[PDB]
Amino acid sequence: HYAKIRPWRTFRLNECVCTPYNADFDGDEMNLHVPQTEEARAEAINLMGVKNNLLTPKSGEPIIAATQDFITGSYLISHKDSFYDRATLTQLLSMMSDGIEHFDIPPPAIMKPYYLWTGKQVFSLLIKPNHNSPVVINLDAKNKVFVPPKSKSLPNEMSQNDGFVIIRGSQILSGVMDKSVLGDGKKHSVFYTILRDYGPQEAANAMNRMAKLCARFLGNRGFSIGINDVTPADDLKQKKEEL
Amino acid sequence: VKTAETGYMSRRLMKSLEDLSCQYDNTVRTSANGIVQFTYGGDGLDPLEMEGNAQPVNFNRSWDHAYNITFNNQDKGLLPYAIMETANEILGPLEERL
Amino acid sequence: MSNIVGIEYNRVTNTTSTDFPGFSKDAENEWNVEKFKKDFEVNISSLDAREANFDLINIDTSIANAFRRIMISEVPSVAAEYVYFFNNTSVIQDEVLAHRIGLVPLKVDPDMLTWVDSNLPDDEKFTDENTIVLSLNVKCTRNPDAPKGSTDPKELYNNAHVYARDLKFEPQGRQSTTFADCPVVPADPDILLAKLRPGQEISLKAHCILGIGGDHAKFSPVSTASYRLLPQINILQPIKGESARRFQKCFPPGVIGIDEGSDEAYVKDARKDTVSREVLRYEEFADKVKLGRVRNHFIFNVESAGAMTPEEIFFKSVRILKNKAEYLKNCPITQ
Amino acid sequence: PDREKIKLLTQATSEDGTSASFQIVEEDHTLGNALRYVIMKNPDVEFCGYSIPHPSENLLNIRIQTYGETTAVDALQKGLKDLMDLCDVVESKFTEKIKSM
Amino acid sequence: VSRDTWNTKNMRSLEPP
Amino acid sequence: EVAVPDRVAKVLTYPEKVTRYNRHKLQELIVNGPNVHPGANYLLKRNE
Amino acid sequence: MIVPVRCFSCGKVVGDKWESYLNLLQEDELDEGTALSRLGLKRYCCRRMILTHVDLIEKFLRYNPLE
Amino acid sequence: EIALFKYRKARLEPGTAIGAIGAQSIGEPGTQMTLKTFHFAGVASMNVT
Amino acid sequence: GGGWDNVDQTKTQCPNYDTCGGESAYFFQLQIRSADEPMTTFYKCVNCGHRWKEN
Amino acid sequence: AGQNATVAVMSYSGYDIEDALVLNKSSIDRGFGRCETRRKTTTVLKRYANHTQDIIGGMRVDENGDPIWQHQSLGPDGLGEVGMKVQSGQIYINKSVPTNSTQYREAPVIYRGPEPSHIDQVMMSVSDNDQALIKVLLRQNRRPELGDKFSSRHGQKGVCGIIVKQEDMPFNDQGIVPDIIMNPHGFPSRMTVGKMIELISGKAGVLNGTLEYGTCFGGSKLEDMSKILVDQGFNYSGKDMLYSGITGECLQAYIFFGPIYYQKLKHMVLDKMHARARGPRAVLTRQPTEGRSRDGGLRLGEMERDCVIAYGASQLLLERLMISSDAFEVDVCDKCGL
Amino acid sequence: XXXXXXLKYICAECSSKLSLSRTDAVRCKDCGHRILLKARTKRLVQFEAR
Numbered sequence A: 001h002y003a004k005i006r007p008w009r010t011f012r013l014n015e016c017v018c019t020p021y022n023a024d025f026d027g028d029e030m031n032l033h034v035p036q037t038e039e040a041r042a043e044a045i046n047l048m049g050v051k052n053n054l055l056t057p058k059s060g061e062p063i064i065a066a067t068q069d070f071i072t073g074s075y076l077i078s079h080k081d082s083f084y085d086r087a088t089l090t091q092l093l094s095m096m097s098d099g100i101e102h103f104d105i106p107p108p109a110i111m112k113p114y115y116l117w118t119g120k121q122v123f124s125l126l127i128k129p130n131h132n133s134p135v136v137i138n139l140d141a142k143n144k145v146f147v148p149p150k151s152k153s154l155p156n157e158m159s160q161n162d163g164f165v166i167i168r169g170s171q172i173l174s175g176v177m178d179k180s181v182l183g184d185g186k187k188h189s190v191f192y193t194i195l196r197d198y199g200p201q202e203a204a205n206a207m208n209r210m211a212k213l214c215a216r217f218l219g220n221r222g223f224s225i226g227i228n229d230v231t232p233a234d235d236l237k238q239k240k241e242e243l
Numbered sequence B: 001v002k003t004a005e006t007g008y009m010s011r012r013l014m015k016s017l018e019d020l021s022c023q024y025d026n027t028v029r030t031s032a033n034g035i036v037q038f039t040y041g042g043d044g045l046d047p048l049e050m051e052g053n054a055q056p057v058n059f060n061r062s063w064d065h066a067y068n069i070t071f072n073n074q075d076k077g078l079l080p081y082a083i084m085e086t087a088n089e090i091l092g093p094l095e096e097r098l
Numbered sequence C: 001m002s003n004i005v006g007i008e009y010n011r012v013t014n015t016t017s018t019d020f021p022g023f024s025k026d027a028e029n030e031w032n033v034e035k036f037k038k039d040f041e042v043n044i045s046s047l048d049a050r051e052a053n054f055d056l057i058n059i060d061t062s063i064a065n066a067f068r069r070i071m072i073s074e075v076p077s078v079a080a081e082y083v084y085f086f087n088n089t090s091v092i093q094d095e096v097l098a099h100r101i102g103l104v105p106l107k108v109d110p111d112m113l114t115w116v117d118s119n120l121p122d123d124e125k126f127t128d129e130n131t132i133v134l135s136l137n138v139k140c141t142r143n144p145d146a147p148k149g150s151t152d153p154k155e156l157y158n159n160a161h162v163y164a165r166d167l168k169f170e171p172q173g174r175q176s177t178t179f180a181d182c183p184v185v186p187a188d189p190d191i192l193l194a195k196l197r198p199g200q201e202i203s204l205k206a207h208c209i210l211g212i213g214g215d216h217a218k219f220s221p222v223s224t225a226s227y228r229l230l231p232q233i234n235i236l237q238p239i240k241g242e243s244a245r246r247f248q249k250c251f252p253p254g255v256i257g258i259d260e261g262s263d264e265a266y267v268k269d270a271r272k273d274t275v276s277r278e279v280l281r282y283e284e285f286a287d288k289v290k291l292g293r294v295r296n297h298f299i300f301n302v303e304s305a306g307a308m309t310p311e312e313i314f315f316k317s318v319r320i321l322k323n324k325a326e327y328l329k330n331c332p333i334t335q
Numbered sequence D: 001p002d003r004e005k006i007k008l009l010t011q012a013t014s015e016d017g018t019s020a021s022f023q024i025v026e027e028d029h030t031l032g033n034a035l036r037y038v039i040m041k042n043p044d045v046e047f048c049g050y051s052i053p054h055p056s057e058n059l060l061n062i063r064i065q066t067y068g069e070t071t072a073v074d075a076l077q078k079g080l081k082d083l084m085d086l087c088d089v090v091e092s093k094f095t096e097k098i099k100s101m
Numbered sequence E: 001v002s003r004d005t006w007n008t009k010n011m012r013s014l015e016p017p
Numbered sequence F: 001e002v003a004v005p006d007r008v009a010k011v012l013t014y015p016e017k018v019t020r021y022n023r024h025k026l027q028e029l030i031v032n033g034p035n036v037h038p039g040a041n042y043l044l045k046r047n048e
Numbered sequence G: 001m002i003v004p005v006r007c008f009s010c011g012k013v014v015g016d017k018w019e020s021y022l023n024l025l026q027e028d029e030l031d032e033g034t035a036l037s038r039l040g041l042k043r044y045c046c047r048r049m050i051l052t053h054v055d056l057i058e059k060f061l062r063y064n065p066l067e
Numbered sequence H: 001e002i003a004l005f006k007y008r009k010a011r012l013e014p015g016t017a018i019g020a021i022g023a024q025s026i027g028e029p030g031t032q033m034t035l036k037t038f039h040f041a042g043v044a045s046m047n048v049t
Numbered sequence I: 001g002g003g004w005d006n007v008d009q010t011k012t013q014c015p016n017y018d019t020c021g022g023e024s025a026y027f028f029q030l031q032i033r034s035a036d037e038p039m040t041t042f043y044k045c046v047n048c049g050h051r052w053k054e055n
Numbered sequence J: 001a002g003q004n005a006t007v008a009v010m011s012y013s014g015y016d017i018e019d020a021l022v023l024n025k026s027s028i029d030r031g032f033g034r035c036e037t038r039r040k041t042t043t044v045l046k047r048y049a050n051h052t053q054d055i056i057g058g059m060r061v062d063e064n065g066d067p068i069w070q071h072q073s074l075g076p077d078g079l080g081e082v083g084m085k086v087q088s089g090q091i092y093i094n095k096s097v098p099t100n101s102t103q104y105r106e107a108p109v110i111y112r113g114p115e116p117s118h119i120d121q122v123m124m125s126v127s128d129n130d131q132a133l134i135k136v137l138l139r140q141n142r143r144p145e146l147g148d149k150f151s152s153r154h155g156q157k158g159v160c161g162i163i164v165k166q167e168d169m170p171f172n173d174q175g176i177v178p179d180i181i182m183n184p185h186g187f188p189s190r191m192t193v194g195k196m197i198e199l200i201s202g203k204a205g206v207l208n209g210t211l212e213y214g215t216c217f218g219g220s221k222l223e224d225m226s227k228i229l230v231d232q233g234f235n236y237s238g239k240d241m242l243y244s245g246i247t248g249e250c251l252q253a254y255i256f257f258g259p260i261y262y263q264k265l266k267h268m269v270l271d272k273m274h275a276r277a278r279g280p281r282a283v284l285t286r287q288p289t290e291g292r293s294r295d296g297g298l299r300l301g302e303m304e305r306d307c308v309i310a311y312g313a314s315q316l317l318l319e320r321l322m323i324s325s326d327a328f329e330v331d332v333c334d335k336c337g338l
Numbered sequence K: 001x002x003x004x005x006x007l008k009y010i011c012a013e014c015s016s017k018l019s020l021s022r023t024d025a026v027r028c029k030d031c032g033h034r035i036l037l038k039a040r041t042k043r044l045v046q047f048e049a050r
């Protein structure tokens, strides 16, 4: 990695790179080594660098990708019920970047009665913030929960849920931002495609953008679990008892 | 029990394949310069670089990406035979190279 | 929708402002005073020496939250910062006693102290314009006239309980005259600082300086400064007879009332309402009631720790926001 | 003359203004969100938004993008002045009500 | 209550340290 | 990237050789010294 | 050990209410809930600060070594 | 062009520690599987290790 | 033969959904981690027999 | 052993992924999670065969009359002053050992601690064999910081990922603010419904003025706790509507809000942070020592060697295993390989 | 103006003030207790009230 000097007493790392280490911030301790020679340092950062090792050599599937809360926040943003006005969208993009990235705001998905952008447009801007960025991604993927379309003849993106992801020209056209699309082990991942098509730096930039956006967005959006999410319905009690 | 039992297994496997490296003539050789594989996997292909199901190229995604990158509503679609002539004009020099 | 925050059984909707140009083709709601100046209203429900309840009406969530954050973490207050132990023979560790003394709020008004500059030597850093000195000298001695079987330590021993009142103001130079009418005293004097047994003594003085709640919580001047959106209850269809009583039991007792003769249920006071969505779990008022919250109607409740009045805290907060805006405007932008 | 308070981030600034990132030290969500709201109430602004890059740094990058009419610096100054006017109005109303009661 | 204190009193504490 | 504590950044050092390209930087680090983080703990002279 | 000066969550002073709460429990006995509501502890954080406190200092003072 | 470029890039590079990579690729999945053979309850098939 | 009719199924689509459209998968849960990580669930597609562990 | 933290079960700040916790600054300021450690050091002034024994004299001064810094908290007795602080390098027991064990060589007890302690108890006594016995208790207050481990009686442990200001924390209608924010992702897979029931029962208990019971196969029924919650104006399921501390808006989801008992665990990051550049080496092997108290190094085992080989980094192998561990310039004869 | 700054032994059981002279004893002089504790230091100890 590249060192970043911080005030506290812990080794901090991006949660995206926890999977290759198998770390889970439960008291885990990791060893840091500082190479002392120029050749060793160059070899370390060029062969063992995080950007150069986003795929496991055992199968080639991506291994550095979104963790739990990042996946949940991405899904909640890309959820079909998510609509954002101009101010909310620009604040989302500023949180996605550090406030130091230019964004070309696309025309809103809804133009009347209000100018509303969907969360899929937010993630399309996450992939390709502006016209200067070269990342043009074309992708077809199945989300892990994909209920098929109402007819056998209908194409896969007509799924009753947003279970099929279509990306054309870095524009997300259908599907939610799932684990199968942003997580590890899938060779149809957005970050896997960005990597294989435009470089580890572009893939890492997309990953950082997504991580910052999710970290700043989930807290303000609100996502919680309680007893009511596990409490059975009253009809379920009777059904279960008879069954 | 698995911890230690599997720990030696990994080290033992490494001890056997510790000095196996791809050479510059595309052969896998021991540290004694003896041939184990004349070509890695009979393919010469790195498993880290396969985009398909254990294949180097995902043809469907590649075709979709190429069509989108090169898309232009003002462009004459080739006849079905002409697509084949372009394909055989690009591939086929490479084919008789072998 | 339209300025009402939707309160549903599983989610909250319409939490964003949508009052800017660019929200729709009608590029309205562009900023201008004489429009905000005419719309904005303040309604002071109550005012006490330590608690204020007032309403900010037709103001934005961002501005109201800026006020709340400044009240909590940016309005300065005076608290003990350095405790110098001459002798601590009690059972409580010195660091623990120092923490508790720092957590004691002092009834010393700010703007009568100057901010301490840390770029100067300790021997020149603390001045009379800069620091309040409070001494605590308490010594526990067994009460010889203790009544028979008087287990209570108050009668068994003398000075067995140290209180915040035991802290005494030590006026330094001008302080003797400037704080003559207002000697620095603990806002809460019954705070149990420590408990001692015979033979234990506590001798210390504390240097109390201005500070910022964002730096340490001891400098925060509000026990809690917070707001809530004004609840809105809409009864879409008439509810009457006994379903009306069942509806009334889903809210705090004085929220909705029962009409006489009409017998229908009506909203009597939505301000008294805690939004528990108890009515939203009963599938018989599902089509009859709509729960909401006015997005731009804020019910501020400011409870001061004791140093200043809550109205003064709120005005200091709005002044702090204005002053940082002014300082940023006057600052020249460096490339 | 405080030259270290607000800085123009030149790498994230377009040509002929209309797009700029300003780094403001010793500021946080309090000023950031109010400033973003006020600036977004400016009809020339097409993009406003702040980010606190790291909780360990007292820092605030605020991104302003406008249309071709005005510049991001102009929009930022206007937003700061408009926040000043907002606070003036709130102060006047609060003082009047506290006096009246 | 219901009396101003900010108008009469110079807010020294609100200066930047 | 990894976020490294300044406390361990002040002990874990890199032995940077002085060239024509970094001499001013290393002079600033030496002046800073071993107690302020953008500093240096040891100096090894060329002929020593 | 001893009652904390402030509630951990709100910062409301609860260290000046411990003895009053004890006296409400003993003299003119009340329920703990109504004794907490009588002192002004409305928020459940300030309520738990007093309800869950364990006064260990009175037990530590039984071993006072400088009698 | 894309397909030929990808096929060329997929070739194993000389000097690769391919033996070590294979050893770890066969051994890392070997630390996640139980030494006791765990079967689906109801198969009643032969107990091959 | 086989008695797979008596094995607990569940509603999970296999990773090889493009080849076989299997909505069900035999499962059994084991805690093969430390007691602070959650349990591990092993799967077997009813349409292809492909095994995988979702943890 | 613990505290009833105000807990909001929500995703927040992104620093709470994978068991990581969000801790309220200003709850830590007010004493939440504030602990301390007391360490004892025992020394014996042993008598020897030559009618000689250790003594504890010391505290030399400078030419201005003050003691030297190494003895700044030492007292005339030569044993650390009770109540004074000791930093790293200072002496709290100035023992000297005879050179012929007339002349005493200095063997003082030196405080080696990254953070200062405070002497809170010096016990001067004698063992059963007329041998002087000295015990010094070193107390050290500890603020909860980044990386400190907390647990919640349900196997849900995790370190402090971030400490955030109170105003940035979400708040409810009464301004109640959480001391701890814990990720909702820890619940579904661990399946700790007992923790949710504990939160609800604790909320109902604080609102009712009574401690509740969570006994095994028993305890306070959930319907009773929900009835208490509804009677006091809260949701039956313990899910209150909060406002964002940084935007001020209503959170679009209701947040599981209530008290949960949280225990601070003995594994603090202050005792785990270790770093070595160069220092003590094994005499036999000339390699870095193998203990944190001995300024030890971190062992790069056969597994890490295997990983670095699989990367193909020969120079990194050389630097980590030869240059930075044990590099010896040997003389080898070309004629005889000796 | 400004502002400036700001060998007794104890028996474990009898709580008596002791003064151990140069190499005299380690016993308590009032009872037979063999455990003595240093009293608190007489000089200033400063803490941050945080």
Ligand SMILES: [Mg+2]
Residues within 6 Å of the ligand: A023, A024, A025, A026, A027, A028
């Ligand atoms: Mg772990």
Ligand SMILES: [Mg+2]
Residues within 6 Å of the ligand: A024, A026, I034, I036, I037
């Ligand atoms: Mg673990």
Ligand SMILES: [Zn+2]
Residues within 6 Å of the ligand: G007, G008, G009, G010, G011, G012, G043, G045, G046, G047
């Ligand atoms: Zn409280």
Ligand SMILES: [Zn+2]
Residues within 6 Å of the ligand: I014, I015, I016, I017, I020, I021, I022, I045, I046, I047, I048, I049, I050
């Ligand atoms: Zn299948």
Ligand SMILES: [Zn+2]
Residues within 6 Å of the ligand: J333, J334, J335, J336
């Ligand atoms: Zn020879």
Ligand SMILES: [Zn+2]
Residues within 6 Å of the ligand: K011, K012, K013, K014, K015, K016, K028, K029, K030, K031, K032, K033
């Ligand atoms: Zn005695």
